[PDB]
Amino acid sequence: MSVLVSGATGFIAQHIVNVLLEQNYKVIGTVRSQEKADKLIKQFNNNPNLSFEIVPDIANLDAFDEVFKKHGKEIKYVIHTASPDYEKDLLIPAVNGTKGILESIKKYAPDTVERVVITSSFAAIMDLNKQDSSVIFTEKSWNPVTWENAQNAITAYCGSKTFAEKAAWDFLKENKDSVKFKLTTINPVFVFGPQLFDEDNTSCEIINELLHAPPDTKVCAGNFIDVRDVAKAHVLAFQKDELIGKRLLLSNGPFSKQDIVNILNKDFPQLKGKIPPADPCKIDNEKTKKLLGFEFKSFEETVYDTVHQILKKEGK
Description:
By secondary structure, the chain is α/β, with parallel strands linked by helices. The protein is 39% helix and 16% strand.
């Protein structure tokens, strides 16, 4: 049947839609405007298996009500990727962005939706105050920040992401006999990779910054995951039964900016001499890798595809 993809304009969500159309799924995406919908319709070459509903503000808890009033009989899988005084402008909006679509499911399609896949984040896993060499974050690690502590300019974003995921798990806890669906969350780190459409910013800006940096520019910035890997995991999350109830930590290891510079220098020979020169908190997500069962893209691959697309836009 039909798959609902929230926020289909997203860097990840467009790839999710491409993967679902790859497998001949019927896809209903939600975007913030009619212009966005028509743009995406054109870019996917008028595929009759793809349609869109307009949901402008997912800070409204009733945002997805019309979607499930119209298509509640056909939506079998839901992939929720969209996301919207720190308590009144970030925290409560995030909790609501999680709870609203689930309330709509509970209202209008409680026995049709079988799987819900929610894009969370590594920010809901890491502990900012433990960034100690013996601490390893796994899929079961949770960000311990409290509601009161999440209202400062350091703990606001990670706190809102954390409580947004907690809200989904709590909804499933308190609504076992009102809904049928099972829940899986996707928790990515820094997401690199190419845009689905050349014609079209993200954290890839980092790469874009070093691709254009003068050679005199001074050079572990975190962990990386390719956007196509995140998209593929989103679909396996509703297809495979061993992914039921799992938090899938999407990461493929640490990276530095010098790694980006080295890839740029050796794989794009036109840039050597025009860019900085070459030079010859831990995560354990082996469980996510085993459960997913496929090999992630390496840092070299994701950087190469990002840079190749950027240089193709520039006529280089």
